[PDB]
């Protein structure tokens, strides 16, 4: 099989070895696409993903590579954006961006501040009780968002009653 992806005018993609770099107005993203007998190349105006094998496992990965590359075309032009909301019941939770990480204080009345380091070139912008994660690398931005929601994880008590925390509101 062979699938051909036409790269936008806005974008510019260059490849070295198994690594692919995609640069655009919103930034650049380099990934590593490695899988037995699948060839990724740049043919001037298009990206080519081809293989001599046609089995279920090869076909699975070929399709995966496509969606990864299309997401890279998007990140460099439009960019990716996840929006979150902070919600609390009794104790006033404090969410802030300190350094290259996001810190959360007074969660459920805690004394110890909960925190997490931001992934790569992701930009977290807070506005009152609303948050917005964004960047070109969908992998990086995606994790960063999820890590914020995972940060208010509670296992000891009933989640149905103790619903405090930041939650993913809008997914791109």
């Amino acid at each position: 099989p062979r699938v051909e992806l036409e790269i936008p005018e806005d974008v510019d993609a260059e490849q070295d070895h198994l690594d692919i770099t995609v640069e655009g107005d919103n930034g650049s993203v380099t990934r590593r696409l490695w899988y037995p007998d699948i060839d990724v190349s740049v043919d001037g105006d298009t990206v080519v993903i081809e293989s001599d094998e046609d089995n279920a496992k090869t076909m699975s990965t070929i399709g995966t590579f496509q969606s990864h590359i299309e997401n890279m075309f998007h990140g460099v032009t439009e960019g990716w954006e996840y929006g979150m909301e902070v919600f609390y019941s009794h104790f006033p939770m404090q969410v802030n961006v300190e350094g290259d990480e996001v810190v959360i204080e007074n969660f459920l009345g805690e004394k110890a501040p909960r925190r997490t380091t931001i992934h790569g070139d992701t930009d977290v912008e807070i506005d009152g009780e609303e948050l917005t994660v964004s960047g070109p690398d969908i992998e990086a931005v995606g994790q960063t968002a999820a890590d914020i929601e995972q940060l208010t994880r509670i296992n000891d008590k009933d989640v149905r009653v103790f619903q405090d925390g930041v939650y993913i509101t809008r997914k791109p």
Partner: protein
């Protein structure tokens, strides 16, 4: 230092056992062999089970002793000893006339033996000697 090697082999990206078998073959034939770039040799398979075997070999032991090397120097030299009758005269000589190296202490580039190479483009399930050594707790001195 200074090994007067008749042959210098490049183990980089080559299947360990297949290389080892040929080195043993030649050493018994009275050849002086130097395996180079051992940290970059390779062994195919699912990494989780490969390491489980090597870590198990480290735990084994008693007062009598079961010394098992953690660095790619030894792992390779031990693999080769396993293909040589090292407890005999002819076999000890052959074994002692073979040495493995981390990186390349020579000027020449080692030759690649037929059948021993692995195509990274065709395979994804394999591991590097150096990667096993790090999991074993060795000191990355390369």
């Amino acid at each position: 230092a200074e090994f007067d090697a008749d042959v210098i082999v490049d183990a980089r990206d080559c299947i360990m056992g297949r290389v080892a078998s040929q080195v043993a073959e030649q050493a018994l034939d009275g050849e002086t062999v130097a395996v180079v770039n051992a940290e970059r040799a390779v062994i195919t398979g699912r990494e989780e089970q490969i390491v489980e075997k090597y870590e198990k070999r480290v735990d084994i032991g008693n007062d009598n002793g079961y010394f098992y090397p953690k660095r790619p120097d030894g792992i390779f030299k031990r693999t080769i000893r396993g293909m040589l009758p090292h407890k005999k005269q002819r076999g000890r000589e052959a074994f002692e006339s073979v040495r493995v190296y981390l990186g390349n202490p020579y000027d020449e580039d080692g030759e690649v033996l037929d059948g021993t190479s692995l195509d990274r483009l065709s395979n994804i399930k394999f591991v590097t000697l150096g990667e096993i050594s790090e999991t074993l707790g060795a000191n990355k001195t390369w």
